[PDB]
Amino acid sequence: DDLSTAILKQKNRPNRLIVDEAINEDNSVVSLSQPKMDELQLFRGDTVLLKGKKRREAVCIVLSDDTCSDEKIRMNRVVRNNLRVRLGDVISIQPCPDVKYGKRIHVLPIDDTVEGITGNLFEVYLKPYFLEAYRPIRKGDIFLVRGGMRAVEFKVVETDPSPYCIVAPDTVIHCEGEPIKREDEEESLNEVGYDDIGGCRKQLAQIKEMVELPLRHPALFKEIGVKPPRGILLYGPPGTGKTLIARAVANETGAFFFLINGPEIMSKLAGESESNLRKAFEEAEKNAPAIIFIDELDAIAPKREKTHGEVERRIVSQLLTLMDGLKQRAHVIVMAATNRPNSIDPALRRFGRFDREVDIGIPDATGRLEILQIHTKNMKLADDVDLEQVANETHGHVGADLAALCSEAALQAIRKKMDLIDLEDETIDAEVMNSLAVTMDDFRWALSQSNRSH
Amino acid sequence: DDLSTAILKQKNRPNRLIVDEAINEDNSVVSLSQPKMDELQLFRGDTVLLKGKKRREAVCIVLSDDTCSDEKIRMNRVVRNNLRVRLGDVISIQPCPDVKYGKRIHVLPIDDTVEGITGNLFEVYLKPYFLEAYRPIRKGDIFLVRGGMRAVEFKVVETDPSPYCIVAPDTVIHCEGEPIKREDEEESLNEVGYDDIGGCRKQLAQIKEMVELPLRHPALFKEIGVKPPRGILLYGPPGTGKTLIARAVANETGAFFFLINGPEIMSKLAGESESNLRKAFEEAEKNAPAIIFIDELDAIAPKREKTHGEVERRIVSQLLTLMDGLKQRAHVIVMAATNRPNSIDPALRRFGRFDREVDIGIPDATGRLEILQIHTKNMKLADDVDLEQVANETHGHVGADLAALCSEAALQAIRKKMDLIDLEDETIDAEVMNSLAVTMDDFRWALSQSNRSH
Amino acid sequence: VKRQEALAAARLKMQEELNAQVEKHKEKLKQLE
Ligand SMILES: Nc1ncnc2c1ncn2[C@@H]1O[C@H](COP(=O)(O)OP(=O)(O)NP(=O)(O)O)[C@@H](O)[C@H]1O
Numbered sequence: 007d008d009l010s011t012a013i014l015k016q017k018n019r020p021n022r023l024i025v026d027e028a029i030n031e032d033n034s035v036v037s038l039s040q041p042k043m044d045e046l047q048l049f050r051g052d053t054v055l056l057k058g059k060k061r062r063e064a065v066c067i068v069l070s071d072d073t074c075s076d077e078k079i080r081m082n083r084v085v086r087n088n089l090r091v092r093l094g095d096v097i098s099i100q101p102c103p104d105v106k107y108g109k110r111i112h113v114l115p116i117d118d119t120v121e122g123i124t125g126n127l128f129e130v131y132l133k134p135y136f137l138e139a140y141r142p143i144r145k146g147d148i149f150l151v152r153g154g155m156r157a158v159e160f161k162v163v164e165t166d167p168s169p170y171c172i173v174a175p176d177t178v179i180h181c182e183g184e185p186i187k188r189e190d191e192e193e194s195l196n197e198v199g200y201d202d203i204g205g206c207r208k209q210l211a212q213i214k215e216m217v218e219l220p221l222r223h224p225a226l227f228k229e230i231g232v233k234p235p236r237g238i239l240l241y242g243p244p245g246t247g248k249t250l251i252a253r254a255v256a257n258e259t260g261a262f263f264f265l266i267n268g269p270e271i272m273s274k275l276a277g278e279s280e281s282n283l284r285k286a287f288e289e290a291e292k293n294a295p296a297i298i299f300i301d302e303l304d305a306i307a308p309k310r311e312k313t314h315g316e317v318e319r320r321i322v323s324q325l326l327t328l329m330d331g332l333k334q335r336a337h338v339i340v341m342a343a344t345n346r347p348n349s350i351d352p353a354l355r356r357f358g359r360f361d362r363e364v365d366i367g368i369p370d371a372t373g374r375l376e377i378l379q380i381h382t383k384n385m386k387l388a389d390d391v392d393l394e395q396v397a398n399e400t401h402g403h404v405g406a407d408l409a410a411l412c413s414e415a416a417l418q419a420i421r422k423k424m425d426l427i428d429l430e431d432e433t434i435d436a437e438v439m440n441s442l443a444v445t446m447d448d449f450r451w452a453l454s455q456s457n458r459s460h
Numbered sequence: 461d462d463l464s465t466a467i468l469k470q471k472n473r474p475n476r477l478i479v480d481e482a483i484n485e486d487n488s489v490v491s492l493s494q495p496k497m498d499e500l501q502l503f504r505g506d507t508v509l510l511k512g513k514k515r516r517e518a519v520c521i522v523l524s525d526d527t528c529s530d531e532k533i534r535m536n537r538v539v540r541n542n543l544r545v546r547l548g549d550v551i552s553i554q555p556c557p558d559v560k561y562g563k564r565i566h567v568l569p570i571d572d573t574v575e576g577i578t579g580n581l582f583e584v585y586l587k588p589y590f591l592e593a594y595r596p597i598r599k600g601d602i603f604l605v606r607g608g609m610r611a612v613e614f615k616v617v618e619t620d621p622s623p624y625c626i627v628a629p630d631t632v633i634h635c636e637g638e639p640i641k642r643e644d645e646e647e648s649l650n651e652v653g654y655d656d657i658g659g660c661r662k663q664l665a666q667i668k669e670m671v672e673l674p675l676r677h678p679a680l681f682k683e684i685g686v687k688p689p690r691g692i693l694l695y696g697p698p699g700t701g702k703t704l705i706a707r708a709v710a711n712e713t714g715a716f717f718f719l720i721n722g723p724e725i726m727s728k729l730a731g732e733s734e735s736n737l738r739k740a741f742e743e744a745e746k747n748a749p750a751i752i753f754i755d756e757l758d759a760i761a762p763k764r765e766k767t768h769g770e771v772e773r774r775i776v777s778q779l780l781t782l783m784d785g786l787k788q789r790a791h792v793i794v795m796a797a798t799n800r801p802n803s804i805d806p807a808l809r810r811f812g813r814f815d816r817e818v819d820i821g822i823p824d825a826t827g828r829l830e831i832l833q834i835h836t837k838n839m840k841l842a843d844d845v846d847l848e849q850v851a852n853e854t855h856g857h858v859g860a861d862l863a864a865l866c867s868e869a870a871l872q873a874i875r876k877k878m879d880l881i882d883l884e885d886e887t888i889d890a891e892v893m894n895s896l897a898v899t900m901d902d903f904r905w906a907l908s909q910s911n912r913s914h
Numbered sequence: 915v916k917r918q919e920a921l922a923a924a925r926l927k928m929q930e931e932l933n934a935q936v937e938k939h940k941e942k943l944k945q946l947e
Pocket residue numbers: 202203204205206242243244245246247248249250251344345377380404405406407409810811
């Protein structure tokens with residue numbers, strides 16, 4: 007019970023701290039209480055490594071704060087964004103003593119932050135920002151600089167040494183080149199992680215313990231004297247978030263991750279399907295520790311009765327040989343997913359192939375609420391919107407149905423303003439845009455539309 | 461209710477006016493009331509942009525008229541034709557201050573308007589027509605000129621600047637080249653638009669809101685924080701106007717529109733079917749915002765059980781990969797249609813593929829009347845013809861059955877005159893042609909023939 | 915300058931010609947009833 011969720015549990019360790027809002031918005035500074043600093047043997051101005059979500063790190067300078075709780079850490083928006091975390095998240099912290107003065111770094115602006123300006127970015131933004139500051143930075147940091155009544159966001163593109171360094175007086179700063187697309191950063195910002203997955207707490211644990219844990223700590227298993235299984239089959243009815251979990255795992259794992267899509271393999275010429283398959287397992291073998299995810303498995307490995315093609319049968323044979331071909335030293339794990347488990351060739355569910363199965367099933371009322379929260383987090387909701395109530399009125403709905411419910415709600419909200427907006431306008435009136443919100447009534451409407459559908 | 465039809469609704473805006481008949485048939489002039497001109501801040505002789513149907517525009521000069529209602533706009537036949545509108549339609553109007561003197565324009569006559577004449581078209585028609593008039597014109601305008609007891613229709617083929625300009629004394633007018641085919645203009649005149657679609661008011665709204673609205677105003681959806689669906693499946697029994705709607709959407713949309721026909725893809729060699737498919741999605745991606753319409757989807761994506769061909773299965777796999785391949789920044793929407801929804805491979809109706817469905821069903825009595833009006837609008841009907849009554853006697857008939865009813869009616873009308881007309885004549889006697897009309901009796905006959913058929 | 919004077923002159927010419935035709939139409943309708 008508490009044991010099956012062991013692996014998700016937040017650890018009462020001294021280096022686990024809760025993210026709180028920052029007093030002062032200096033992008034390189036984070037604040038602890040002094041007893042907390044004493045405990046972790048951190049002195050004022052030490053350089054530290056933070057771990058947030060989705061493999062993110064930040065390097066910061068740690069400072070004392072008497073308004074900061076012992077168990078809390080203050081950090082401005084910029085650092086939180088770099089760690090992919092929100093206020094209330096828990097992050098981990100360690101000294102970083104190894105961190106060298108940078109020889110050069112390359113940064114570039116975000117494009118929607120600069121259109122247009124003459125000014126020299128180094129002279130006007132970056133030199134005053136870095137001047138005698140000896141700021142720590144990491145490849146992939148985004149940071150904001152003020153200058154002359156304007157603010158400019160930069161991305162760290164390269165450091166030398168990589169991936170982090172301290173920017174000294176003698177560090178060469180390059181700012182020259184094509185500005186970074188905002189849309190491209192907004193794509194990255196919105197990668198799926200584990201916190202985008204609602205209602206699957208137990209199955210995320212099963213996955214973490216059959217996939218992440220044995221690739222990350224193969225010692226545990228050798229010590230106690232057992233081989234971890236190598237084939238994990240996610241199953242469940244449509245829209246329960248199997249593919250979502252695949253994307254989360256890809257963005258959270260420390261392993262090399264290779265996605266195979268069923269239909270896409272099956273769309274290839276004879277022989278090229280087989281080739282790609284072999285190449286996937288070869289690449290993962292070579293780049294171990296590694297995960298292969300086969301999404302929509304049923305497409306490439308239906309029951310050898312179903313499939314009236316000799317090539318289609320040849321492909322399944324190839325899969326099975328590739329699975330069996332995973333010699334025990336490879337550290338490769340294969341996950342796969344299907345909404346039709348009975349439709350899969352049974353030989354794939356034998357010992358040493360897909361020998362563990364995880365039911366990504368229909369969520370319950372509490373799960374549905376988690377889902378609704380995740381989905382609406384970036385939505386403009388009115389105060390009347392009671393998601394708990396919506397959770398309670400959506401029995402048998404799965405994640406995908408809840409997403410569409412929320413789309414339908416929104417669209418109704420938009421419908422309510424269609425007397426001001428024309429298809430033929432080039433523009434949307436701003437006070438119309440800013441007042442736009444999804445009401446409970448909109449959700450009520452959507453709900454009632456969904457009882458035909460179900 | 462009023463909300464689900466929101467998006468169709470005529471806006472009580474000052475620049476929305478009802479088309480009425482014109483006092484004076486000057487092709488460049490349109491007349492408002494003076495208080496209307498005052499309201500829109502238009503002074504006598506200002507140049508204006510009109511929007512009519514089917515993406516049509518006209519540039520005109522606006523003049524005062526005390527016989528014109530405030531809410532009305534007077535325009536001659538020529539302008540109405542250019543806007544593709546009839547008397548009683550609502551059009552939109554704005555100032556056009558940006559409009560430059562033309563460097564050259566190219567116009568050509570319609571061929572049935574000139575067979576034969578020596579005369580120099582410029583000297584005899586166009587110079588007197590444009591002389592010191594500074595007329596505004598647009599590429600694709602058709603206009604009529606009087607001269608020496610004859611009338612000549614011209615088409616604007618090219619302008620420079622494009623697409624509109626003012627024809628000044630110093631504007632070069634080219635009239636030289638091969639005359640424009642009347643049949644070709646009559647093809648264009650008769651493009652299908654939304655007003656050619658009867659009985660689908662609610663479904664035209666659903667389509668406008670899932671397709672036109674999110675390609676035209678992707679801001680709305682980003683603001684409120686939701687992704688619009690990308691796959692719209694029209695379904696319904698045969699002859700309900702799914703393909704009609706496809707043609708209307710193609711002629712009304714502001715997006716790039718690519719038609720794929722099921723049978724036609726399926727008629728290709730192995731591998732060429734796949735190729736064309738990829739090329740369609742590539743072209744739309746490249747030319748976004750864009751619509752792909754897949755008509756008769758069931759032909760290319762029947763249940764992977766139905767289809768005993770490996771190539772046929774390969775094609776469906778390709779479709780699904782192309783659908784999934786629509787990354788969220790593409791602004792491509794895929795519509796498709798089928799009269800067999802149950803026959804489609806279910807994987808195509810999953811989340812992120814064809815996840816919205818629109819029932820283009822059997823119309824009701826009011827719908828049937830709309831259809832009958834649309835279909836007979838260009839027909840010679842006698843006064844005894846009561847279409848409401850015909851609507852009432854056609855339960856279960858769909859649009860295509862109503863079209864055929866009207867054909868059968870006509871043919872009976874022709875049958876009634878077969879004592880005067882021979883197969884062997886080269887010619888039809890004119891008084892026979894001019895008296896030809898469809899009577900109610902003809903419709904009654906047709907109706908009775910249709911009760912065997914049903 | 916002279917271009918705008920030409921445009922304005924043609925626009926004035928247009929307005930007076932519409933006014934002339936309004937009155938003709940009006941007369942026709944009176945004769946009709
Ligand atoms: N557990 C979940 N938590 C949050 N959102 C979810 C969840 N499950 C589904 N959704 C939402 O619905 C979308 C579609 O689900 P998806 O991840 O495609 O499920 P799936 O099981 O892979 N579908 P299928 O492949 O049809 O069996 C997701 O991308 C989310 O937007």
